[PDB]
PDB file of C-alpha atoms and ligand atoms in Angstrom:
ATOM      1  CA  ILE A   1       8.458 -34.034  -8.060  1.00 25.59           C
ATOM      2  CA  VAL A   2       5.294 -35.554  -6.631  1.00 22.80           C
ATOM      3  CA  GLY A   3       2.270 -33.423  -6.202  1.00 19.55           C
ATOM      4  CA  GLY A   4       3.549 -30.367  -8.093  1.00 15.48           C
ATOM      5  CA  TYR A   5       2.727 -28.549 -11.350  1.00 16.98           C
ATOM      6  CA  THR A   6       4.366 -28.057 -14.679  1.00 17.51           C
ATOM      7  CA  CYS A   7       6.666 -25.068 -14.294  1.00 18.41           C
ATOM      8  CA  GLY A   8       6.420 -23.885 -17.918  1.00 16.31           C
ATOM      9  CA  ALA A   9       9.270 -23.650 -20.366  1.00 16.24           C
ATOM     10  CA  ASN A  10      12.305 -21.730 -19.092  1.00 16.31           C
ATOM     11  CA  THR A  11      10.502 -20.296 -16.210  1.00 14.84           C
ATOM     12  CA  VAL A  12      13.266 -21.699 -13.941  1.00 12.32           C
ATOM     13  CA  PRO A  13      16.307 -20.489 -15.953  1.00 13.98           C
ATOM     14  CA  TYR A  14      18.994 -21.588 -13.405  1.00 12.15           C
ATOM     15  CA  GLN A  15      17.857 -25.257 -13.502  1.00 11.96           C
ATOM     16  CA  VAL A  16      20.263 -27.667 -15.131  1.00 14.18           C
ATOM     17  CA  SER A  17      20.163 -31.352 -16.011  1.00 12.11           C
ATOM     18  CA  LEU A  18      23.208 -33.549 -15.447  1.00 10.95           C
ATOM     19  CA  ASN A  19      23.451 -35.975 -18.350  1.00  9.57           C
ATOM     20  CA  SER A  20      25.623 -38.994 -18.785  1.00  7.01           C
ATOM     21  CA  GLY A  21      23.709 -40.523 -21.711  1.00  7.07           C
ATOM     22  CA  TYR A  22      20.597 -39.859 -19.704  1.00  8.33           C
ATOM     23  CA  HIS A  23      19.253 -37.454 -17.159  1.00  6.66           C
ATOM     24  CA  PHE A  24      20.362 -38.558 -13.724  1.00  5.47           C
ATOM     25  CA  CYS A  25      20.354 -35.540 -11.378  1.00 10.06           C
ATOM     26  CA  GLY A  26      19.495 -31.874 -11.390  1.00  9.97           C
ATOM     27  CA  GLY A  27      21.625 -28.838 -10.499  1.00  7.86           C
ATOM     28  CA  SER A  28      21.795 -25.045 -10.292  1.00  8.19           C
ATOM     29  CA  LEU A  29      23.678 -22.535 -12.406  1.00  9.72           C
ATOM     30  CA  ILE A  30      25.531 -20.163  -9.985  1.00  6.67           C
ATOM     31  CA  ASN A  31      27.556 -18.233 -12.527  1.00  8.24           C
ATOM     32  CA  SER A  32      28.517 -18.654 -16.203  1.00  7.67           C
ATOM     33  CA  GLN A  33      30.990 -21.490 -15.625  1.00  6.54           C
ATOM     34  CA  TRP A  34      29.928 -23.181 -12.324  1.00  2.71           C
ATOM     35  CA  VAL A  35      27.066 -25.510 -11.272  1.00  2.00           C
ATOM     36  CA  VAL A  36      26.135 -26.617  -7.738  1.00  2.00           C
ATOM     37  CA  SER A  37      24.705 -30.190  -7.209  1.00  2.00           C
ATOM     38  CA  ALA A  38      24.532 -33.038  -4.634  1.00  3.73           C
ATOM     39  CA  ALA A  39      27.788 -34.904  -3.877  1.00  6.40           C
ATOM     40  CA  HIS A  40      25.657 -38.128  -4.116  1.00  5.58           C
ATOM     41  CA  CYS A  41      25.183 -37.384  -7.834  1.00  5.35           C
ATOM     42  CA  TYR A  42      28.942 -37.571  -8.472  1.00  6.58           C
ATOM     43  CA  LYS A  43      29.847 -39.448 -11.683  1.00  5.28           C
ATOM     44  CA  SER A  44      32.676 -39.190 -14.178  1.00  5.10           C
ATOM     45  CA  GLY A  45      31.777 -38.085 -17.681  1.00  5.74           C
ATOM     46  CA  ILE A  46      29.003 -35.568 -16.891  1.00  2.71           C
ATOM     47  CA  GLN A  47      27.579 -33.255 -19.527  1.00  3.97           C
ATOM     48  CA  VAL A  48      25.669 -30.189 -18.296  1.00  5.38           C
ATOM     49  CA  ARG A  49      22.325 -29.354 -20.046  1.00  7.95           C
ATOM     50  CA  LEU A  50      21.105 -25.704 -19.773  1.00  7.26           C
ATOM     51  CA  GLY A  51      17.995 -24.123 -21.251  1.00  3.14           C
ATOM     52  CA  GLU A  52      15.973 -27.364 -20.985  1.00  5.36           C
ATOM     53  CA  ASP A  53      12.257 -27.896 -20.652  1.00  3.30           C
ATOM     54  CA  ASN A  54      11.505 -31.216 -22.362  1.00  4.04           C
ATOM     55  CA  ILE A  55      14.664 -33.238 -21.766  1.00  2.61           C
ATOM     56  CA  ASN A  56      13.744 -35.593 -24.579  1.00  2.13           C
ATOM     57  CA  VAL A  57      13.157 -32.878 -27.259  1.00  2.47           C
ATOM     58  CA  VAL A  58      15.457 -30.216 -28.710  1.00  2.00           C
ATOM     59  CA  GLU A  59      13.283 -27.099 -28.567  1.00  2.28           C
ATOM     60  CA  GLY A  60      15.694 -24.259 -29.225  1.00  2.00           C
ATOM     61  CA  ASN A  61      16.957 -22.833 -25.957  1.00  2.00           C
ATOM     62  CA  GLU A  62      19.492 -25.505 -24.983  1.00  2.00           C
ATOM     63  CA  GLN A  63      23.236 -25.296 -24.209  1.00  2.00           C
ATOM     64  CA  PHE A  64      25.063 -28.616 -23.697  1.00  2.00           C
ATOM     65  CA  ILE A  65      28.498 -28.126 -22.205  1.00  2.00           C
ATOM     66  CA  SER A  66      30.789 -30.839 -20.786  1.00  2.00           C
ATOM     67  CA  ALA A  67      32.172 -30.602 -17.272  1.00  2.00           C
ATOM     68  CA  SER A  68      35.948 -29.874 -16.993  1.00  2.00           C
ATOM     69  CA  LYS A  69      36.227 -30.593 -13.215  1.00  2.00           C
ATOM     70  CA  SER A  70      34.027 -31.860 -10.420  1.00  2.00           C
ATOM     71  CA  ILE A  71      34.735 -31.100  -6.729  1.00  2.00           C
ATOM     72  CA  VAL A  72      33.017 -33.019  -3.971  1.00  2.00           C
ATOM     73  CA  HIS A  73      32.907 -31.303  -0.546  1.00  2.00           C
ATOM     74  CA  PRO A  74      35.913 -32.388   1.445  1.00  2.56           C
ATOM     75  CA  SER A  75      33.705 -33.662   4.249  1.00  2.00           C
ATOM     76  CA  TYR A  76      31.098 -35.457   2.334  1.00  2.00           C
ATOM     77  CA  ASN A  77      29.891 -38.645   4.047  1.00  2.00           C
ATOM     78  CA  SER A  78      28.037 -40.982   1.811  1.00  2.00           C
ATOM     79  CA  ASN A  79      26.560 -43.059   4.600  1.00  2.00           C
ATOM     80  CA  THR A  80      24.986 -40.104   6.427  1.00  2.00           C
ATOM     81  CA  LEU A  81      24.669 -37.763   3.482  1.00  6.50           C
ATOM     82  CA  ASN A  82      26.146 -35.055   5.657  1.00  5.70           C
ATOM     83  CA  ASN A  83      27.718 -32.279   3.466  1.00  7.18           C
ATOM     84  CA  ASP A  84      25.861 -33.515   0.323  1.00  4.89           C
ATOM     85  CA  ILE A  85      27.172 -30.887  -2.010  1.00  7.50           C
ATOM     86  CA  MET A  86      29.332 -30.745  -5.118  1.00  5.99           C
ATOM     87  CA  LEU A  87      30.810 -28.112  -7.546  1.00  6.00           C
ATOM     88  CA  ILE A  88      31.038 -28.721 -11.336  1.00  3.73           C
ATOM     89  CA  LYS A  89      33.063 -26.391 -13.582  1.00  4.46           C
ATOM     90  CA  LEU A  90      31.971 -26.127 -17.237  1.00  5.50           C
ATOM     91  CA  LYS A  91      34.565 -26.493 -20.044  1.00  3.88           C
ATOM     92  CA  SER A  92      33.197 -23.288 -21.571  1.00  4.78           C
ATOM     93  CA  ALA A  93      31.200 -20.438 -20.016  1.00  6.51           C
ATOM     94  CA  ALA A  94      27.439 -20.537 -20.648  1.00  8.86           C
ATOM     95  CA  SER A  95      25.738 -17.697 -22.587  1.00  5.74           C
ATOM     96  CA  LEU A  96      23.405 -16.098 -20.065  1.00  7.04           C
ATOM     97  CA  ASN A  97      19.970 -14.634 -21.109  1.00  9.77           C
ATOM     98  CA  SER A  98      16.404 -14.404 -19.758  1.00  9.34           C
ATOM     99  CA  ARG A  99      15.985 -18.152 -20.300  1.00  7.57           C
ATOM    100  CA  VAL A 100      19.466 -19.166 -19.093  1.00 13.58           C
ATOM    101  CA  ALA A 101      20.435 -17.295 -15.974  1.00 13.70           C
ATOM    102  CA  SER A 102      22.365 -17.858 -12.732  1.00 16.73           C
ATOM    103  CA  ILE A 103      20.813 -17.994  -9.269  1.00 17.20           C
ATOM    104  CA  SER A 104      22.246 -15.918  -6.386  1.00 16.89           C
ATOM    105  CA  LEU A 105      23.932 -17.540  -3.407  1.00 16.53           C
ATOM    106  CA  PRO A 106      22.349 -16.577  -0.102  1.00 16.40           C
ATOM    107  CA  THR A 107      23.658 -13.960   2.395  1.00 15.66           C
ATOM    108  CA  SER A 108      21.497 -15.344   5.260  1.00 18.74           C
ATOM    109  CA  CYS A 109      19.951 -18.720   6.117  1.00 17.61           C
ATOM    110  CA  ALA A 110      16.270 -18.841   5.461  1.00 17.65           C
ATOM    111  CA  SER A 111      13.961 -19.577   8.402  1.00 18.54           C
ATOM    112  CA  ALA A 112      11.243 -22.160   9.002  1.00 17.44           C
ATOM    113  CA  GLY A 113       8.016 -20.934   7.542  1.00 17.45           C
ATOM    114  CA  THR A 114       9.580 -19.483   4.389  1.00 15.83           C
ATOM    115  CA  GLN A 115       7.980 -20.704   1.177  1.00 18.87           C
ATOM    116  CA  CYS A 116      10.398 -22.002  -1.498  1.00 20.43           C
ATOM    117  CA  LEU A 117      10.263 -23.397  -5.019  1.00 22.35           C
ATOM    118  CA  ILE A 118      11.634 -26.874  -5.730  1.00 20.14           C
ATOM    119  CA  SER A 119      11.955 -28.154  -9.337  1.00 19.48           C
ATOM    120  CA  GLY A 120      13.149 -31.133 -11.325  1.00 19.69           C
ATOM    121  CA  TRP A 121      12.476 -34.018 -13.695  1.00 20.23           C
ATOM    122  CA  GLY A 122      12.232 -36.764 -11.001  1.00 19.45           C
ATOM    123  CA  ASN A 123       9.521 -39.389 -10.399  1.00 16.66           C
ATOM    124  CA  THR A 124       6.022 -37.965 -10.009  1.00 18.82           C
ATOM    125  CA  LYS A 125       4.523 -40.921  -8.101  1.00 14.52           C
ATOM    126  CA  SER A 126       4.643 -41.952  -4.384  1.00 15.07           C
ATOM    127  CA  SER A 127       3.993 -45.535  -5.373  1.00 17.20           C
ATOM    128  CA  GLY A 128       5.428 -46.817  -8.657  1.00 19.01           C
ATOM    129  CA  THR A 129       7.391 -45.030 -11.439  1.00 21.48           C
ATOM    130  CA  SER A 130       6.487 -42.291 -13.887  1.00 24.82           C
ATOM    131  CA  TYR A 131       9.073 -39.863 -15.119  1.00 21.57           C
ATOM    132  CA  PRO A 132       7.904 -36.600 -16.710  1.00 20.46           C
ATOM    133  CA  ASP A 133       9.687 -35.283 -19.681  1.00 17.90           C
ATOM    134  CA  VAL A 134       9.012 -31.606 -18.793  1.00 16.93           C
ATOM    135  CA  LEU A 135      10.120 -29.651 -15.761  1.00 16.31           C
ATOM    136  CA  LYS A 136       7.925 -29.890 -12.626  1.00 17.87           C
ATOM    137  CA  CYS A 137       7.726 -27.342  -9.801  1.00 20.40           C
ATOM    138  CA  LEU A 138       6.569 -27.509  -6.113  1.00 21.65           C
ATOM    139  CA  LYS A 139       6.144 -24.667  -3.680  1.00 21.65           C
ATOM    140  CA  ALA A 140       6.846 -25.848  -0.172  1.00 19.60           C
ATOM    141  CA  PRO A 141       7.649 -24.309   3.233  1.00 16.24           C
ATOM    142  CA  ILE A 142      10.812 -24.828   5.242  1.00 17.14           C
ATOM    143  CA  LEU A 143       9.800 -26.811   8.376  1.00 15.82           C
ATOM    144  CA  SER A 144      11.160 -26.218  11.792  1.00 16.48           C
ATOM    145  CA  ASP A 145      14.277 -28.038  12.902  1.00 15.60           C
ATOM    146  CA  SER A 146      12.156 -29.600  15.658  1.00 17.02           C
ATOM    147  CA  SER A 147       9.644 -31.070  13.264  1.00 19.07           C
ATOM    148  CA  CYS A 148      12.506 -32.218  11.086  1.00 20.62           C
ATOM    149  CA  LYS A 149      14.530 -33.986  13.797  1.00 21.00           C
ATOM    150  CA  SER A 150      11.371 -35.495  15.033  1.00 22.34           C
ATOM    151  CA  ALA A 151      10.539 -36.998  11.678  1.00 21.92           C
ATOM    152  CA  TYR A 152      14.107 -38.292  11.241  1.00 20.86           C
ATOM    153  CA  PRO A 153      15.428 -39.031  14.713  1.00 17.72           C
ATOM    154  CA  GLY A 154      19.245 -39.326  14.814  1.00 18.93           C
ATOM    155  CA  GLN A 155      19.731 -38.409  11.160  1.00 17.36           C
ATOM    156  CA  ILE A 156      19.434 -34.655  10.889  1.00 21.79           C
ATOM    157  CA  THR A 157      22.650 -32.576  11.100  1.00 20.55           C
ATOM    158  CA  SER A 158      23.172 -28.836  11.158  1.00 19.85           C
ATOM    159  CA  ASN A 159      23.811 -28.868   7.423  1.00 16.29           C
ATOM    160  CA  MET A 160      20.378 -30.150   6.569  1.00 16.74           C
ATOM    161  CA  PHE A 161      16.875 -28.883   6.612  1.00 17.49           C
ATOM    162  CA  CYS A 162      13.402 -30.289   5.983  1.00 17.61           C
ATOM    163  CA  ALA A 163      10.836 -28.749   3.698  1.00 14.01           C
ATOM    164  CA  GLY A 164       7.466 -29.917   2.562  1.00 12.60           C
ATOM    165  CA  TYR A 165       4.356 -31.262   4.190  1.00 13.84           C
ATOM    166  CA  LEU A 166       4.167 -33.724   7.120  1.00 13.18           C
ATOM    167  CA  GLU A 167       0.771 -34.778   5.719  1.00 12.46           C
ATOM    168  CA  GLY A 168       2.650 -36.055   2.631  1.00 10.80           C
ATOM    169  CA  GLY A 169       1.307 -35.959  -0.958  1.00 13.22           C
ATOM    170  CA  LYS A 170       3.854 -33.396  -2.247  1.00 15.36           C
ATOM    171  CA  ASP A 171       7.614 -33.728  -2.219  1.00 16.41           C
ATOM    172  CA  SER A 172      10.712 -34.165  -4.276  1.00 19.41           C
ATOM    173  CA  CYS A 173      11.585 -37.656  -5.508  1.00 23.55           C
ATOM    174  CA  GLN A 174      14.165 -39.893  -7.322  1.00 22.47           C
ATOM    175  CA  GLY A 175      15.769 -37.966 -10.153  1.00 26.97           C
ATOM    176  CA  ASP A 176      15.136 -34.580  -8.473  1.00 28.00           C
ATOM    177  CA  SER A 177      18.394 -34.915  -6.451  1.00 27.93           C
ATOM    178  CA  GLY A 178      21.035 -32.162  -6.792  1.00 28.22           C
ATOM    179  CA  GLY A 179      18.244 -29.718  -7.895  1.00 28.93           C
ATOM    180  CA  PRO A 180      17.495 -26.267  -6.436  1.00 28.55           C
ATOM    181  CA  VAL A 181      15.427 -25.085  -3.541  1.00 27.07           C
ATOM    182  CA  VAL A 182      15.132 -21.346  -4.033  1.00 27.27           C
ATOM    183  CA  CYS A 183      13.600 -19.004  -1.513  1.00 27.07           C
ATOM    184  CA  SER A 184      13.144 -15.327  -2.009  1.00 26.34           C
ATOM    185  CA  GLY A 185      15.233 -15.453  -5.179  1.00 27.18           C
ATOM    186  CA  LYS A 186      18.238 -17.108  -3.507  1.00 25.49           C
ATOM    187  CA  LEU A 187      19.578 -20.675  -3.597  1.00 24.72           C
ATOM    188  CA  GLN A 188      18.814 -22.059  -0.078  1.00 27.16           C
ATOM    189  CA  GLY A 189      18.718 -25.800  -0.664  1.00 29.45           C
ATOM    190  CA  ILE A 190      19.841 -28.767  -2.700  1.00 27.65           C
ATOM    191  CA  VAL A 191      17.552 -31.792  -3.030  1.00 28.48           C
ATOM    192  CA  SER A 192      19.400 -34.437  -1.051  1.00 30.43           C
ATOM    193  CA  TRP A 193      17.388 -37.262   0.572  1.00 27.97           C
ATOM    194  CA  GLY A 194      14.209 -38.534   2.243  1.00 30.39           C
ATOM    195  CA  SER A 195      12.532 -41.759   3.147  1.00 30.83           C
ATOM    196  CA  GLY A 196      10.571 -42.713   0.035  1.00 30.39           C
ATOM    197  CA  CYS A 197       8.620 -39.700  -1.496  1.00 30.17           C
ATOM    198  CA  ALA A 198       5.564 -37.743  -0.399  1.00 31.70           C
ATOM    199  CA  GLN A 199       4.922 -40.137   2.492  1.00 27.39           C
ATOM    200  CA  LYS A 200       3.145 -39.036   5.732  1.00 26.64           C
ATOM    201  CA  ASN A 201       5.674 -37.646   8.195  1.00 25.08           C
ATOM    202  CA  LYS A 202       8.646 -38.135   5.957  1.00 25.06           C
ATOM    203  CA  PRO A 203       9.369 -34.736   4.348  1.00 21.98           C
ATOM    204  CA  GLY A 204      12.251 -34.154   1.896  1.00 20.67           C
ATOM    205  CA  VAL A 205      15.681 -33.393   3.406  1.00 14.72           C
ATOM    206  CA  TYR A 206      17.839 -30.710   1.727  1.00 11.49           C
ATOM    207  CA  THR A 207      21.458 -29.553   2.015  1.00 13.53           C
ATOM    208  CA  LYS A 208      21.622 -26.112   3.821  1.00 15.63           C
ATOM    209  CA  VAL A 209      23.480 -24.043   1.189  1.00 16.32           C
ATOM    210  CA  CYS A 210      23.950 -21.013   3.451  1.00 14.61           C
ATOM    211  CA  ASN A 211      26.516 -23.117   5.447  1.00 13.45           C
ATOM    212  CA  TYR A 212      28.731 -23.589   2.356  1.00 11.36           C
ATOM    213  CA  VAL A 213      28.910 -20.087   0.856  1.00 10.59           C
ATOM    214  CA  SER A 214      32.488 -19.413   2.012  1.00  9.23           C
ATOM    215  CA  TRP A 215      33.476 -22.826   0.654  1.00  9.32           C
ATOM    216  CA  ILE A 216      31.796 -22.180  -2.665  1.00  7.11           C
ATOM    217  CA  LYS A 217      33.277 -18.794  -3.085  1.00  6.40           C
ATOM    218  CA  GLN A 218      36.818 -19.844  -2.159  1.00  5.26           C
ATOM    219  CA  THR A 219      36.729 -22.867  -4.533  1.00  5.83           C
ATOM    220  CA  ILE A 220      35.395 -20.883  -7.412  1.00  5.89           C
ATOM    221  CA  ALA A 221      38.114 -18.260  -6.832  1.00  6.87           C
ATOM    222  CA  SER A 222      40.899 -20.811  -7.058  1.00  4.87           C
ATOM    223  CA  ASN A 223      39.848 -23.279  -9.728  1.00  7.36           C
TER     224      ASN A 223
HETATM  225 CA1   CA B   1      15.030 -29.981 -24.636  1.00  3.61          CA
END
C-alpha cells in the first residue's frame, strides 16, 4: 500500500496472508473454511495465515492453516487478467472471533463515488522497494468506468473496476494482490493489477466481486 496508514492490529479481521515460506499475496476470509484471492496469486503449497498484524512476529492471535484445494475461475485469462479470482478451501475450519472474522459477499455492485478500504502488506513506495511488516490500510473511492477506461484504454473489462486517485500518490502495490477492497462492510473488490503504483493517471484495477457471487456460492456448496 502506498500512501496509506497503519491499520492497527486486527482491525481488519477478514484479511489473510498467503504464505509459501514467505508472504506473497493477500486474501479475504469469506466463511470459516473458504478464502477468496486473485487467480494470478495461484501457487501450489499455500498456507493460509489468519489473525496477523506483524507477519514477521508471532503476537498471539494467529491461525495458520494449510489449503486443501485451490480453484481458479474457469475463465481466468492470465494475459488480460480478466476474471482474476480464485477460491482456496482450508484443511480445517478457522475459529472465528472479534479478531478473526469473515467478510460478507455483496448483494449489489457498489457505484463510482463509494469510499472503500484497501489493505495489505505490499510495497509502500512508488519508486524503489520497502515492505512493511505490519498491515497497511488505504481509503479510496471507486472511480467511474469512464475515468477507468480512459486511463487504461483497451484493457478494462466488465469484471474490473478502478479505485484510487488519478493524481496518484496513494494506491495498492506489489504484494497487496489478492487482498480485499471492502465497501460498506461488503467485499466489493480484489486487488488485481495496475501500471506501476501510485502513478499519475494510473489508478489500481480491481476484480468486480459482485459479478462472481453466484459462482462463489455454487462452488462453495459443492466442494
Ligand atoms: Ca504475526
